[PDB]
UniProtKB/TrEMBL annotation:
Family note: Belongs to the peptidase S8 family.
Predominant location: secreted
Top-level taxonomic group: Bacteria
Domain Peptidase S8/S53: start-end pairs: 33-331
A cellular-component GO term for this protein: extracellular region
Annotated positions binding Ca(2+): 5, 51, 116, 119, 121, 123
Phylogenetic lineage: Bacteria, Pseudomonadati, Pseudomonadota, Gammaproteobacteria, Lysobacterales
UniProt name for this protein: Alkaline serine protease
Active-site feature positions: 42 (charge relay system), 105 (charge relay system), 289 (charge relay system)
Provenance organism: Stenotrophomonas maltophilia
Subcellular location: Secreted
Amino acid sequence: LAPNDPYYQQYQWHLHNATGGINAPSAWDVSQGEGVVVAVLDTGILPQHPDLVGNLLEGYDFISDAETSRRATNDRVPGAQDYGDWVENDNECYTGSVAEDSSWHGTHVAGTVAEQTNNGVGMAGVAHKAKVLPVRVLGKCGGYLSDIADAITWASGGTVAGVPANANPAEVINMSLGGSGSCDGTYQDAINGAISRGTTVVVAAGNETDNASKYRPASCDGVVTVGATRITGGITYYSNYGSRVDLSGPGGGGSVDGNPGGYVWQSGSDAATTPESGSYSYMGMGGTSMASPHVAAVAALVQSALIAKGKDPLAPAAMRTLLKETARPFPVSIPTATPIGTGIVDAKAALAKALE
Ligand SMILES: [Ca+2]
């Protein structure tokens, strides 16, 4: 499939480039992810973005701190509106932290997953007939372990006190987020609950040019930990690495690969602070955060194809083996000290194996 989105051809190398893209044109002839729900645990969402609306469920805001969520209370509320995660001053988040504009990070991630495609508007997405369930866990200066833990439980269909039952349990969870420290008992239990409910959990390896075993949920047992590659198919300068990384996806090499080839492109805003301070747009970003949703969306394409054929969806362990086993080996040498999994996720190879 060669869709008509205006900026797809020139910008979206991560979809279609022969050496760094995930072979989406060919996968899209088999599956677009219809019927599957991907939960995006992130900064929240711009719910009326015109290239997203239509593929979004209402979702939920798990941030239990008014100063972080920028809401009027510490409650968790229905809906996932991103209020903006800008930080006005250096050092507000921690000693050494730097002021920055709002990221609209979860709208970017959600676009990778399911940006409306072949609609004559903007950019494309991978699982463009799936639904995104947006679950806001990150705000000003980030988020809290126990909000992220609970969001996992709820997104995968488990019960969380104070939150109404999730009417749309997710086949896949994406976590384009992490922190310092190897996996703790709280994260692992939450992850374990999600797996026991049939949910595949896909996470970003992290961007510290460091061993993924030192970060979470990168280092947690049972998840699909995703490294970052360049348009060239080589490791990015920032990708974490190590035996915990299962495979990679396009993260964008950064300025070394220029504009547009250094960046992943999707739905966003140019707003600096609140949503109202700017307008809907398309942004280019780099990180393992951008690689992870490509993998999470491929998992969605596969569950959807299996169901469409009346076959049984894969359990989490099977899904992870499949993604790993069908990854395209790197077109450029990966340094021995920094392994980033079996290869670059290949949506078409993943589909061909699953379907027989
Ligand atoms: Ca579009």
